[PDB]
Amino acid sequence: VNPTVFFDIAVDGEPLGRVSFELFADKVPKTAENFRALSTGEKGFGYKGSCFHRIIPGFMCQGGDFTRHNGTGGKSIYGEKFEDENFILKHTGPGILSMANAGPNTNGSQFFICTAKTEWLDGKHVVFGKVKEGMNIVEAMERFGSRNGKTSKKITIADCGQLE
Amino acid sequence: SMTEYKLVVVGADGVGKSALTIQLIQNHFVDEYDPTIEDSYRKQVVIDGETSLLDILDTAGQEEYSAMRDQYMRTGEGFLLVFAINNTKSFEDIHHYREQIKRVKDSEDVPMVLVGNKSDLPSRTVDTKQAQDLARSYGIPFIETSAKTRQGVDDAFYTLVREIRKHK
Ligand SMILES: CCn1c(-c2cc(N3CCN(C)CC3)cnc2[C@H](C)OC)c2c3cc(ccc31)-c1csc(n1)C[C@H](NC(=O)[C@H]1C[C@@H]1C)C(=O)N1CCC[C@H](N1)C(=O)OCC(C)(C)C2
Ligand SMILES: Nc1nc2c(ncn2[C@@H]2O[C@H](COP(=O)(O)OP(=O)(O)NP(=O)(O)O)[C@@H](O)[C@H]2O)c(=O)[nH]1
Ligand SMILES: [Mg+2]
């Protein structure tokens, strides 16, 4: 039974709304479990309080750097990085949740949510979840982005956790 | 009003394109890796007694998007071809960048400067003579740089401005 997690998103501190995600533990359990644990904060660190640092309309919203808060950091629950678990799942369209990386076997905590199909990322980024509720929140985040991804307001994960 | 020069910094991922540019613009050194999508900067400088406005385009090193370089190569007036002196692959990549610029601009005569960056590191795999010989075969200057120590940073950008001036 795949776990569900939520982000409550804020924009310059004002509430925007909740996005929830199904995590495909049935296909990518190690990668799903990393995102789950980081969403609950149960290791003493995680996504709460961190920003979506890169938003590119037409493509994706990227976030998850809770260690440096500048887009360069993050870490997994397994160590700073972990290997690509599999590439079974594809970037098929809006709402796909997939790991950011800096090349093979460099998954940390950064992730991205597709707002379109991004098939050229297939086989390079591990897909491990999908938006379940609140895709309209992700759509509304897009207008705070730009061509190179710089955001015009601070888009933050004000709260996050696991739904029962 | 001062002349504007459209400079473009190209080269394989991680060679220090951004570190060099941020050193020029902000006078400090980024030790963390923030892979570039695309960034643009402006700085006025004085070169050979003439005040010039530098418009710098700092480009992505991702090979995946090699097909999308054509538009900024068409627009750019001069190119820094950057490799890292401890990364023989990035040196090998230089040829592809130069050939791509020549093709897109349809000219044998495009202002370019070869930049061998990370000169501060002990782990050198590209001999200075190899780089120098390659530059001479291209007919372009070669500048050795460190974004970390600032060695050669101004020289690389200023030499490229000088190359554009000769071309115009
Ligand atoms: C050519 C200009 N460009 C473009 C690009 C590509 C297209 N098309 C390609 C597909 N065809 C079919 C249509 C045209 C059109 N328009 C642009 C942009 C809008 O032109 C300005 C991209 C891109 C990505 C990188 C560099 C330059 C880049 C890059 C630079 S590091 C990277 N990717 C991977 C990135 N690692 C990190 O952050 C590491 C540091 C952390 C730990 C990462 O895991 N993720 C998650 C997946 C998405 C990716 N970031 C990202 O941001 O993708 C941006 C996107 C727009 C999707 C692609
Ligand atoms: N020691 C040393 N490190 C350097 C130097 N130039 C860059 N670096 C380091 O090399 C890494 C990559 O640098 P960066 O400027 O991001 O390279 P890039 O060419 O812009 N990479 P991209 O193509 O992804 O945008 C960073 O850790 C940076 O600190 C240098 O001259 N010396
Ligand atoms: Mg860069």
Author numbering:
A (entry chain D): 2 to 165
B (entry chain A): 0 to 167
Share the article's original sentences.
Here, we describe RMC-6236, a potent, oral RAS(ON) multi-selective tri-complex inhibitor designed to treat cancers driven by a variety of RAS mutations, and with the potential to overcome many of the frequent resistance mechanisms reported following inactive-state RAS-GDP inhibition. Here, we describe the preclinical characterization and key observations driving the initial clinical translation of the investigational agent, RMC-6236, which is structurally related to RMC-7977 and shares a conserved binding site and binding mode in the tri-complex formed between RAS(ON) proteins and CypA. To characterize the steps of tri-complex formation, we first determined RMC-6236 affinity for CypA protein (KD1), which was 55.3 nmol/L. Next, we evaluated the affinity of the RMC-6236:CypA binary complex for KRASG12V, KRASG12D, and KRASWT (KD2), which were 131, 364, and 154 nmol/L, respectively. We then measured the biochemical potency of RMC-6236 for RAS-RAF complex disruption in vitro using recombinant RAS variants, the RAS-binding domain of BRAF (RAF-RBD), and CypA proteins. Formation of the tri-complex with either wild-type KRAS, NRAS, or HRAS proteins potently disrupted RAF-RBD binding in a concentration-dependent manner, with EC50 values of 85, 66, and 82 nmol/L, respectively. Because CypA is indispensable for tri-complex formation, and thus essential for RMC-6236 activity, we also evaluated the potential effect of differential CypA expression as a modifier of RMC-6236 response. Furthermore, consistent with the biochemical activity observed against multiple RAS variants and cellular pERK inhibition potency in RAS mutant cell lines, RMC-6236 caused potent growth inhibition of KRAS mutant cancer cell lines, exemplified by HPAC (KRASG12D/WT, PDAC) and Capan-2 (KRASG12V/WT, PDAC) with EC50 at 1.2 and 1.4 nmol/L, respectively.
